[PDB]
Ligand binder design. Structure first.
Ligand SMILES: Cc1cc2nc3c(=O)[nH]c(=O)nc-3n(C[C@H](O)[C@H](O)[C@H](O)COP(=O)(O)OP(=O)(O)OC[C@H]3O[C@@H](n4cnc5c(N)ncnc54)[C@H](O)[C@@H]3O)c2cc1C
Ligand SMILES: Cc1cc2nc3c(=O)[nH]c(=O)nc-3n(C[C@H](O)[C@H](O)[C@H](O)COP(=O)(O)OP(=O)(O)OC[C@H]3O[C@@H](n4cnc5c(N)ncnc54)[C@H](O)[C@@H]3O)c2cc1C
Ligand SMILES: NC(=O)c1ccc[n+]([C@@H]2O[C@H](COP(=O)([O-])OP(=O)(O)OC[C@H]3O[C@@H](n4cnc5c(N)ncnc54)[C@H](OP(=O)(O)O)[C@@H]3O)[C@@H](O)[C@H]2O)c1
Ligand SMILES: NC(=O)c1ccc[n+]([C@@H]2O[C@H](COP(=O)([O-])OP(=O)(O)OC[C@H]3O[C@@H](n4cnc5c(N)ncnc54)[C@H](OP(=O)(O)O)[C@@H]3O)[C@@H](O)[C@H]2O)c1
Ligand SMILES: [Mg+2]
Ligand SMILES: [Mg+2]
Lengths: 443, 443
């Protein structure tokens, strides 16, 4: 028969396994599936590790999540249409669960699907090549359980390796003279490390917002944030100041674009991440900034130069889990032969049409509605349940307004599931005081 | 003609270029040489970076050196026989220079040799394969200057990528519950980060000795060290306690094998490094612990399954720079056809003979004399100057006794060059008080 390689057992890889299992449960013949995962367990970014830099086997540490991390959007926006919160938890819960609670939810679905046996854990993909004549990809991997490098062939490769793990780490004048810790958001683990310290966060997106907020919540003496161009602009607490871009640092002091200065103990670069695919030749290698519409990906998925090489989840994310499902189901239907792809020139013209719309977006609302409309297109093409994109959009709108209202209070609010209609119930403790991050303490 | 790939422009790679240039200066025809270096400049481990984890291009950070690092052995033990300290510095200096001063020395030789133009910087080796019929290696690299992956063929590959950059990072019960920083020695940058903090160093070799010592010198409140089996055993200062192995950690406290405990702010794993060659297939991939005599390396250099694949500097190090020269000169003479290699079975028998001697070593003296005798064998086979191994051995003996005498004072002592006979002169400031690490301040 035919063979599919899946790189990664995070949400996207797991969605891809779930897609095939769902078809198989309803009598479809499916390919052989091999999912290569470098970590010891599934969950991707949702799997926490204390490790930083490089893991015990010498691979770059994948994990960017930190202690005390909670859902940064309404859980109702990322609900699986085919495995509801009601089915998983059997009661209502808060709209903004800690990492461990959503990890439990993600695992719950693939536990139920019985797909764990497709996965080869502790295995890092090292190289991918393609042979024109056989139409096969050769995938070379290192099995760290046995310290052995091996290669197998596959008809399709689905790259679900993520793009929020390889840091974008810009130098600033004087980092080599500064006496405090300099790290990337990717290396941030326990905010208690910065208790009673004066912290600088460099950046103006979610990592800056949230890492700064954890430092606040867990007793940092002061937060300073700085932006390259656009301030985050929220009303910050008393001990937080937002400044224009860092110019330089000396042994202990940071100097900003406006000529102001601050004594700081540590610098956290919240400067985003790179799409980094060291295991790909240029012929297969997506090169893009973090955005809603990278080019060369037909339906945001199929590599236009070789559409038997697929990318999942490589867009920037408003939607997340149910976008990955939408992608995984479309990918599956194409691999099964149910949906055929057009010719390259047509794929290129359509990708460019999406790009032109992408380039016009200005407002947050335009941006999540763009991605909503992309997902609507995918879900209409397959048997993934066509859920209510418009109502999810309205939830995202409400969340944005909650964050404006109170950047430290938005996680206390409650939203209705668009899959089941059940309202989320208030959490037992306000976010700011909910110091314990465990699944036990939350439930 | 013929082509040689060299992986890395650290001391070993540079030694390899210097070896060929030295032969060429005296009329030898030499191969085309391409040295691939992932960093932006030469020097290897001696090139300092503030970066930790992964570099700006997404490659694991190579650098393990930290602020305030000085020579941990007498400089007279690592002198180049073909480029003396006298020639480079034109006067005597201390026996234990800061990193920047020996970097200057290393660069000085290859500046004089004019070999920089062989090197392709910002280029990471990604894969190596070998073709039986052509007898060529295919070396695939990523050029980060241009974001392009390319492959070229070579008759020989000399792997000079080091083995003190990929950390050995063991888990200890509770690391995911501890509130302070957990890092490896590889990530240690500025000891001022730990000023007034209670530090734990895990390990009992050079990284534990020296990182603990920097923390001491730069005002850590206390140092705790712990050993897996053998204590370091030096007489430590008042605020330093050596303990048996860490058993576990809670939110702020470490618990040891003897039942004792200590509140700690940060944990630094000084637990060594891995030989990690992700760019090699198993057919070419050396698997070894850090030791004086890994197997499968004929004359400690030639991969016994394919001796056109060479490893430099993969032994544990008492000797360093002039061992790498000795290796590089032997490698060069074999590549030039001046020295022929015996058959595999003979290579295996001889490697095993070295191993049997290696396995019997117990004392520090036995260990550096073993490596001395290995180097004597290499230097006698080529035109590298046959320098006085016995006197270098006696210097190593004297250094060991100086460290016993005073683990914070040994860097104040002076030793005679075995290349020129000139005595090192006392430094202007005692190590403990010499807070400034610059080349300027030292000279
Ligand atoms: C710090 C952080 C917080 C977040 N918080 C939220 C949130 O609250 N809500 C939300 O909806 N989204 C959040 N996200 C978004 C996140 O991207 C998605 O939730 C989701 O994890 C993406 O799934 P993925 O499978 O595409 O990638 P990932 O979850 O990153 O998984 C990629 C997988 O590929 C594996 N892998 C990588 N390279 C290789 C290789 N060479 N060989 C083998 N395996 C490999 C990894 O180990 C990993 O398991 C967050 C992201 C980050 C970085
Ligand atoms: C923290 C520390 C302190 C030390 N202090 C001393 C001392 O005081 N005295 C002493 O004699 N020795 C010291 N050493 C020993 C050190 O190993 C040697 O001095 C010497 O640096 C080894 O040279 P090398 O060229 O084998 O390896 P390295 O100096 O490590 O150089 C390896 C090179 O290969 C490059 N590289 C790696 N992988 C790739 C790739 N895939 N593609 C392209 N390039 C790559 C690296 O960027 C680097 O330039 C120290 C070592 C460490 C780790
Ligand atoms: N659940 C949570 O609480 C949580 C926490 C952290 C992260 N996350 C998730 O992690 C993902 C990534 O978010 P992110 O914020 O890390 O990345 P991001 O959204 O890609 O944003 C990158 C930030 O870096 C800035 N930047 C880039 N280069 C810079 C430079 N040289 N100097 C200064 N600033 C620079 C950008 O500024 P410009 O925009 O001006 O270029 C932007 O503010 C998202 O999915 C996010 O939701 C979630
Ligand atoms: N110039 C300088 O001042 C300086 C500073 C730092 C490093 N260096 C150099 O860096 C190189 C590496 O030295 P290194 O000390 O990092 O490595 P190393 O010499 O390989 O020693 C590794 C240490 O880790 C211990 N260890 C290993 N696994 C462990 C575990 N699971 N738990 C507890 N302990 C464990 C070992 O104990 P056992 O031996 O009991 O196994 C040993 O003490 C050397 O060339 C060194 O000179 C130089
Ligand atoms: Mg951006
Ligand atoms: Mg060891």
């Amino acid at each position: 028969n035919t063979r599919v390689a899946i790189i990664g057992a995070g949400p996207c890889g797991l969605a891809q396994l779930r897609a095939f299992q769902s078809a198989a449960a309803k009598g479809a013949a499916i390919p052989e599936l091999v999912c290569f995962e470098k970590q010891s367990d599934w969950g991707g970014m949702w799997n926490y590790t204390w490790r930083t830099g490089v893991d015990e086997h010498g691979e770059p540490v994948h994990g960017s999540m930190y202690r005390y991390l909670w859902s940064n959007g309404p859980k109702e926006c990322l609900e699986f249409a085919d495995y509801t919160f009601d089915e998983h938890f059997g009661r209502p819960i808060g709209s903004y669960p800690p990492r461990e609670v959503l990890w439990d939810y993600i695992k719950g679905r693939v536990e139920k699907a019985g797909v764990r046996d497709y996965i080869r854990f502790n295995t890092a993909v090292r190289q991918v090549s393609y042979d024109e004549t056989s139409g096969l990809f050769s995938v070379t991997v290192q099995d760290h359980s046995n310290n052995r490098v091996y290669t197998e062939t596959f008809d399709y490769v689905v790259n679900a390796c993520g793009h929020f793990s390889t840091p974008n780490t810009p130098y600033f004048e004087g980092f080599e003279r500064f006496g405090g810790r300099v790290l990337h958001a990717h290396d941030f683990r326990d905010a208690l490390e910065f208790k009673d310290k004066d912290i600088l966060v460099v950046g103006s997106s979610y990592s800056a917002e949230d890492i700064g907020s954890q430092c606040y919540k867990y007793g940092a003496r002061s937060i300073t944030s700085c932006y390259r161009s656009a301030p985050m602009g929220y009303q910050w607490p008393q001990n937080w100041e937002e400044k224009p871009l860092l110019q330089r640092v000396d042994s202990d002091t940071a100097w900003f674009a406006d000529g102001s200065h601050k004594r700081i103990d540590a610098i956290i670069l919240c400067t985003g991440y790179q799409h980094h695919f060291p295991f790909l030749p240029d012929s297969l290698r997506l090169i893009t900034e973090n955005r809603l519409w990278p080019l060369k990906l037909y339906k945001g998925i199929f590599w236009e130069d070789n559409p038997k090489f697929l990318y999942l989840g490589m867009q920037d994310q408003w939607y997340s889990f149910n976008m990955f499902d939408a992608q995984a189901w479309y990918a599956r239907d194409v691999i099964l032969g149910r949906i055929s792809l057009p010719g390259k020139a047509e794929m290129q013209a359509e990708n460019q049409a999406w790009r032109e719309r992408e380039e016009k977006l200005q407002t947050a609302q335009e941006m999540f509605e763009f991605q909503g409309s992309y997902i609507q297109h995918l879900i209409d093409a397959t048997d993934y349940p066509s859920f209510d994109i418009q109502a999810v959009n309205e939830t995202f709108l409400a969340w944005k307004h909650d964050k404006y209202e109170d950047i430290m209070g938005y996680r206390n609010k409650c939203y209705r599931s668009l899959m089941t209609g059940t309202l989320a119930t208030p959490h037992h403790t306000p976010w700011l005081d909910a110091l314990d991050d465990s699944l036990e303490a939350y439930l």
